Design a protein around this nucleic acid. Structure first.
Ligand SMILES: CN[C@@H]1[C@@H](O)[C@@H](O[C@@H]2[C@@H](O)[C@H](O[C@H]3O[C@H](CN)CC[C@H]3N)[C@@H](N)C[C@H]2N)OC[C@]1(C)O
Ligand SMILES: [Mg+2]
Ligand SMILES: [Mg+2]
Ligand SMILES: [Mg+2]
Ligand SMILES: [Mg+2]
Ligand SMILES: [Mg+2]
Ligand SMILES: [Mg+2]
Ligand SMILES: [Mg+2]
Ligand SMILES: [Mg+2]
Ligand SMILES: [Mg+2]
Ligand SMILES: [Mg+2]
Ligand SMILES: [Mg+2]
Ligand SMILES: [Mg+2]
Ligand SMILES: [Mg+2]
Ligand SMILES: [Mg+2]
Ligand SMILES: [Mg+2]
Ligand SMILES: [Mg+2]
Ligand SMILES: [Mg+2]
Ligand SMILES: [Mg+2]
Ligand SMILES: [Mg+2]
Ligand SMILES: [Mg+2]
Ligand SMILES: [Mg+2]
Ligand SMILES: [Mg+2]
Ligand SMILES: [Mg+2]
Ligand SMILES: [Mg+2]
Ligand SMILES: [Mg+2]
Ligand SMILES: [Mg+2]
Ligand SMILES: [Mg+2]
Ligand SMILES: [Mg+2]
Ligand SMILES: [Mg+2]
Ligand SMILES: [Mg+2]
Ligand SMILES: [Mg+2]
Ligand SMILES: [Mg+2]
Ligand SMILES: [Mg+2]
Ligand SMILES: [Mg+2]
Ligand SMILES: [Mg+2]
Ligand SMILES: [Mg+2]
Ligand SMILES: [Mg+2]
Ligand SMILES: [Mg+2]
Ligand SMILES: [Mg+2]
Ligand SMILES: [Mg+2]
Ligand SMILES: [Mg+2]
Ligand SMILES: [Mg+2]
Ligand SMILES: [Mg+2]
Ligand SMILES: [Mg+2]
Ligand SMILES: [Mg+2]
Ligand SMILES: [Mg+2]
Ligand SMILES: [Mg+2]
Ligand SMILES: [Mg+2]
Ligand SMILES: [Mg+2]
Ligand SMILES: [Mg+2]
Ligand SMILES: [Mg+2]
Ligand SMILES: [Mg+2]
Ligand SMILES: [Mg+2]
Ligand SMILES: [Mg+2]
Ligand SMILES: [Mg+2]
Ligand SMILES: [Mg+2]
Ligand SMILES: [Mg+2]
Ligand SMILES: [Zn+2]
Lengths: 150, 155, 87, 129, 81, 144
RNA sequence: GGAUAGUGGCCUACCAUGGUUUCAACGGGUAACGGGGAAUAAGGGUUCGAUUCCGGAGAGGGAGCCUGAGAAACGGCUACCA
RNA sequence: GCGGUAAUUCCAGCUCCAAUAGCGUAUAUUAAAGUUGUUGCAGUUAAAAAGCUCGUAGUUGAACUUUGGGCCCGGUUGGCCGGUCGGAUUUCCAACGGGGCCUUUCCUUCUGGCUACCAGGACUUUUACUUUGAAAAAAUUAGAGUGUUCAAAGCAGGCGUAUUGCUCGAAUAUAUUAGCAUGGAAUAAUAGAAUAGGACG
RNA sequence: AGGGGAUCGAAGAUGAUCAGAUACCGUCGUAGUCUUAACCAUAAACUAUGCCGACUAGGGAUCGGGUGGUGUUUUUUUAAUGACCCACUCGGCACCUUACGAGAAAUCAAAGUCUUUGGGUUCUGGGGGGAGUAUGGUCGCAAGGCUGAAACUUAAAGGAAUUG
């Protein structure tokens, strides 16, 4: 548990036993699917949105109130990004680390984490290529990474 | 490979003893002999519809399939009108009562009936010696895509 | 411990811990047999008439002999209240 | 991580009857755990077990009488062919008369004695006594 | 110890345990319908905040997040469901 | 979990690891190095004949004091000088020098036998007449 | 195409850039012919097999060849080296 | 470990032990050896965890998808009776397995042949495993038979009407990894419909 | 290779000491000690103790986070706090008592779930010495790092505990 550290922590979300639920929620799939896509229009992430519709509005889990998950809906709606968001913030993070490194190469612990972060990046891509969400030959490139974040 | 020129060799390429009479005017031009290799194997349409020549093609050629018949996946398409397949298989070590992964790389002449790609499993019938390496001949192609379509453009 | 035909052989069919259903063998010297007296109307205890249990050496050493008999006796009728099967 | 679920379950079982306990929680159940527990139950080494329902893999509560000495998994699932079932038994089973080597065959998870009579074999699974 | 009911454990000793480690895992958070009579009606908020919510009409603060459940700003009522 | 790999498919890693490790087994090693044929004074054979160079009394290690009559021998087939021991009482008066002695090991597979150090061999026959039969009276040493 | 009894880079012309390998290629060693089999007797294993049967090689070392259905023969020839 | 002056170990006589036409020895080898450890090792201090993390090959890798139920047919051993001339079979009773139906349910599909496979067309996601079989040299080995006078052997021989012949034998089993054929569908891989380039007609 | 260079201080200089005293102690003091840029890759680099996963037992403390409380403090005035208390729960640095178990023992909550022997996997070791030597390959500017035999030799070396 926790590949790149000794971290044994158990921290997660405990998903409920009720598969339909809550029984107190009105509105409908039309209302939330419309609600999803306006925030995707704004540019929020399935992680950012599902929280937003958890806190502000009345969605316990959007996977239920609509028979599809959040990203699958964005995909069908053309609002899907070209690379998944976990991979995005993986690459987006290493872009900032190596950025701090060009400022100070004296910092060894930074040079160290950059290995672990980039290891994880190459692992995700390898899987994403296996399942064909990214083309075969998709590779994480150092200098071409700053251009994929922005 | 193949896939054009039909004549590209300094030798005039033709089927043996299949004669097109010039005086007898035909609108099909070529008269093209074929057979079905047997062993419950479809002689494919492109072997008939095709314009090609090759005599090592078990459907239109003078080689006959007999003996072993083998499954294996294509690791190399790099040769023109032949290919190499990796048939893996497991080996049992009696002492340890376990298995170890092995493989054997089989060159096999691919008739220009088939479009073969790397990664496609292939069925292969045994034939007379063809080249130095090749004792076997492509017969049936078991994979028509092998993930080819799932790679797609953005939108 | 029977045989070819019929007869029971092999001396000494051993006891069992009533709590854990474990064979209690000759050398288990922390093993124990409890004799609980069955009384009659007006509280007199009827000497020689017993509800008995055997408790393995293991259960006593672990500290479970107390809670084991409490379970073992109450469901046998000698008590109520006290022990809860659920926790 | 987790490799043999069945092994994990046959553990807490043996870790129960070594501590004396008559009830053990196991997670995350299985298809094989079921059929193995079944074979254990039907020959009398456990009581009744209840698969409970979470929405993931489930749990199980197994009641064990104490008649059991050792249950356990054979970790690699070994091919055994009909003539080696004897060989396999003689190693881990206390005496000829009782105990069961239980395994998996194309005819279903079953012990060697049931295997003998049906006369099919398969890969090994575990053992119970 | 040595005998206890695993199938039917006490809900009182259950609710002390960790959300994952109960007999069946489930979330312990809640949903409240929260009121600022400066608005006639309610926006329904999740208990452990993150996003610090506004009411549909005016820009106004219901909660601010913490690690756990949110600080409900100043006067509000709430209905749990 | 006793790091030997358990896998049903780990056969190679299993049989390789043991092949790798038999080198720690000693005379497994000596088997495949050919050390019998390569080094050691005998060819890798039971006995070997040779010729006496000198008669050397060896003083035995503690807690013993003796003078153990031995012979520097040069192996015919081989050419190695090797130093061997003469058994029982006298028996050094049966050899002298330039003689042809049959040697055997000491029965320890190398590894000198006794308070006699560094001597791995023993005299069996001299002049082909079998030191026993000379020590008892059964034979006498050949004329010349 | 030549050649062979015949297939085949067997050889030859033009042509292609291919074929093997950490699933150990390639290389080095073998006091290595391989198999039937042999010893040691919980099982599992370990060790050996020049040698009475089968298969393969060779007739001092190499090549070459005649005769013939059949030999690259050696109790056939020709040459070399010994 | 014996021997430097009373030697239970040397050299001898006497006696006694072990095996016995045999016994000693050197060398290899197997068992002893769970001291090579798949079965089946040890690794804190005896020999032995890389200074630390990453990471390719290798080994390995959570759970879930036909469950349960109802109705037939046919087998082989076991009893309680036996009917009978030691075995004979039907009913009573179990015990283990095999096949087939229906409960929403292809074992490929059509065209007839026939009453279960004929042969022909058209197609079929591919594996590991486990069953059974066919094909498998003798000798060797395990082993039935046979009184080489015993025996290792050998595969002979054994019976009268031994003056004109009769006649049982020369079994069986083992053979494995791969190959072929076949019953199995558990465990474990593998492929499928998602920008539908989807399935059926 | 520059800078820096207070202090301490391998070399070296010495004063004492001893039979000797190239030392211990005293005294001076070069390199060093710091730093910039490049090298080096070793330590008893230690928990002399692989990583992932399941399970097996009580107890009070403690670190960080979170949950509950008609709990105590502050007060300015309920509040809001902020520290404190009590209980629960995850994840941590540890500690006590135990011994169902383990072990040669010292001791171990793992070193337990092992002849009733199988969760996944990496690494190492196979009497002592010769020896971490020779050799070859490779890394380094160098010192050195890595990999790494054999001949021969030898009955013990060795671990924990026990009594003297
Ligand atoms: C602390 N170092 C240890 C070393 O001491 C030793 O440890 C073993 C340990 O592996 C065995 O345990 C192992 O085998 C068990 C089988 N019953 C279960 C799995 C595993 N824990 C223990 N039974 C004995 C220890 N001394 O072997 C493994 C190791 C990691 O090197
Ligand atoms: Mg990790
Ligand atoms: Mg990792
Ligand atoms: Mg965890
Ligand atoms: Mg065993
Ligand atoms: Mg290797
Ligand atoms: Mg080596
Ligand atoms: Mg070593
Ligand atoms: Mg020799
Ligand atoms: Mg001299
Ligand atoms: Mg000595
Ligand atoms: Mg001689
Ligand atoms: Mg030819
Ligand atoms: Mg040779
Ligand atoms: Mg050999
Ligand atoms: Mg063999
Ligand atoms: Mg041979
Ligand atoms: Mg001979
Ligand atoms: Mg010849
Ligand atoms: Mg030459
Ligand atoms: Mg030569
Ligand atoms: Mg010749
Ligand atoms: Mg001759
Ligand atoms: Mg001849
Ligand atoms: Mg010359
Ligand atoms: Mg010569
Ligand atoms: Mg005397
Ligand atoms: Mg003696
Ligand atoms: Mg005497
Ligand atoms: Mg002898
Ligand atoms: Mg095994
Ligand atoms: Mg050991
Ligand atoms: Mg050590
Ligand atoms: Mg370490
Ligand atoms: Mg490394
Ligand atoms: Mg080190
Ligand atoms: Mg799985
Ligand atoms: Mg699984
Ligand atoms: Mg059914
Ligand atoms: Mg064999
Ligand atoms: Mg400097
Ligand atoms: Mg200075
Ligand atoms: Mg000085
Ligand atoms: Mg002194
Ligand atoms: Mg002093
Ligand atoms: Mg000073
Ligand atoms: Mg330390
Ligand atoms: Mg620790
Ligand atoms: Mg170390
Ligand atoms: Mg520890
Ligand atoms: Mg080491
Ligand atoms: Mg040695
Ligand atoms: Mg070293
Ligand atoms: Mg060393
Ligand atoms: Mg070193
Ligand atoms: Mg070197
Ligand atoms: Mg470099
Ligand atoms: Mg150099
Ligand atoms: Zn508002």
């Amino acid at each position: 548990g926790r590949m790149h550290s000794a971290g044994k922590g158990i921290s997660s979300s405990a998903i409920p036993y009720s598969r339909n639920a809550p029984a107190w929620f009105k509105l409908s799939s039309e209302s939330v699917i419309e609600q999803i896509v306006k925030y995707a229009r704004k540019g929020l992430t399935p992680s950012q949105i599902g929280v937003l519709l958890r806190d502000a509005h009345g969605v316990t889990q959007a996977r239920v109130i609509t028979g599809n998950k959040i990203m699958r809906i964005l995909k069908s709606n053309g609002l899907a990004p070209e690379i998944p968001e976990d991979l995005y913030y993986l690459i987006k993070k290493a872009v900032s680390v190596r950025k701090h490194l060009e400022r100070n190469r004296k910092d060894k612990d930074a040079k160290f984490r950059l290995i672990l972060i980039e290891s994880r990046i190459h692992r995700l891509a390898r899987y994403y290529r296996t399942v064909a969400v990214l083309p075969p030959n998709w590779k994480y490139e150092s200098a071409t990474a700053s251009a994929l974040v922005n | 490979s193949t896939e054009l020129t039909v004549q590209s060799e300094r030798a005039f390429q033709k089927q043996p003893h299949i004669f097109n009479n010039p005086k007898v005017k035909t609108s099909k031009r070529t008269k093209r002999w074929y057979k079905n290799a047997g062993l419950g194997f479809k002689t494919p349409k492109t072997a008939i519809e095709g314009s090609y020549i090759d005599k090592k093609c078990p459907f239109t050629g003078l080689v006959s399939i007999r003996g072993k018949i083998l499954t294996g996946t294509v690791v190399s398409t790099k040769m023109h009108r032949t290919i190499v397949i990796r048939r893996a298989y497991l080996h049992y070590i009696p002492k340890y009562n376990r298995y170890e992964k092995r493989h054997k790389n089989v060159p096999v002449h691919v008739s220009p009936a088939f479009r073969v790609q790397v990664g496609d499993i292939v069925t292969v019938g045994q034939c007379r010696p063809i080249s130095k390496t090749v004792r076997f001949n492509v017969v049936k192609v078991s994979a028509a895509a092998g993930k080819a379509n799932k790679q797609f453009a953005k939108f | 411990m029977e045989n070819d035909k019929g007869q029971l052989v092999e001396l000494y069919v051993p006891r069992k811990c009533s709590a854990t259903n474990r064979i209690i063998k000759a050398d288990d010297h922390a093993s124990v047999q409890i004799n609980v007296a069955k009384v009659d109307e007006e509280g007199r205890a009827i000497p020689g008439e017993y509800v008995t249990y055997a408790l393995s050496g293991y259960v006593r050493s672990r500290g479970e002999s107390d809670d084991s008999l409490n379970r073992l006796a109450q469901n046998d009728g000698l008590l109520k209240n006290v022990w809860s099967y659920s926790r | 991580t987790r490799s043999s679920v069945l092994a994990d379950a046959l553990n807490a079982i043996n870790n129960a009857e070594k501590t004396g306990k008559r009830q053990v929680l196991i997670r995350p159940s299985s298809k094989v755990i079921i059929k193995f527990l079944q074979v254990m139950q039907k020959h009398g080494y456990i009581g009744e077990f209840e698969y409970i329902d979470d929405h993931r893999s489930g749990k199980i509560v197994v009641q064990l009488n104490g008649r059991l000495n050792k249950c356990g998994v054979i970790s690699p699932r070994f091919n055994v062919k009909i003539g080696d079932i004897e060989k396999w038994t003689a190693n881990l089973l206390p005496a000829r008369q009782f105990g069961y080597v239980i395994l998996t065959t194309s005819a279903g998870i079953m012990d060697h004695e049931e295997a003998r009579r049906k006369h099919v074999s398969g890969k090994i699974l575990g053992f119970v006594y | 110890v040595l005998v206890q009911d695993l199938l039917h454990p006490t809900a009182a000793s259950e609710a002390r345990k960790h959300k994952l480690k109960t007999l069946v895992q489930g979330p312990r958070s809640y949903f409240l319908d929260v009121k600022c009579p400066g608005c006639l009606n309610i926006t329904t908020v999740f208990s452990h905040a993150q996003t610090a919510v506004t009411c549909e009409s005016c820009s106004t603060i219901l909660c601010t997040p913490t690690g756990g459940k949110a600080k409900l700003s100043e006067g509000t009522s709430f209905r749990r469901k | 979990g006793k790091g030997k790999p358990r896998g049903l498919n780990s056969a190679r890693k299993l049989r390789v690891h043991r092949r790798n490790n038999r080198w720690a087994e000693n005379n497994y090693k000596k088997r495949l190095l050919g050390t019998a044929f390569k080094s050691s004074p005998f060819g890798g054979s039971s006995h070997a004949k040779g010729i006496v160079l000198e008669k050397l009394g060896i003083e035995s290690k503690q807690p013993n004091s003796a003078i153990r009559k031995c012979v520097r021998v040069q192996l015919i087939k081989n050419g190695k000088k090797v130093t061997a021991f003469v058994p029982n009482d006298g028996c050094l008066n049966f050899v002298d020098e330039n003689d042809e002695v049959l040697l055997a090991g000491f029965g320890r597979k190398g590894k000198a036998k006794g308070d006699i150090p560094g001597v791995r061999f023993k005299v069996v026959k001299v002049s082909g007449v079998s030191l026993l039969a000379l020590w008892k009276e059964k034979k006498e040493k050949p004329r010349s």
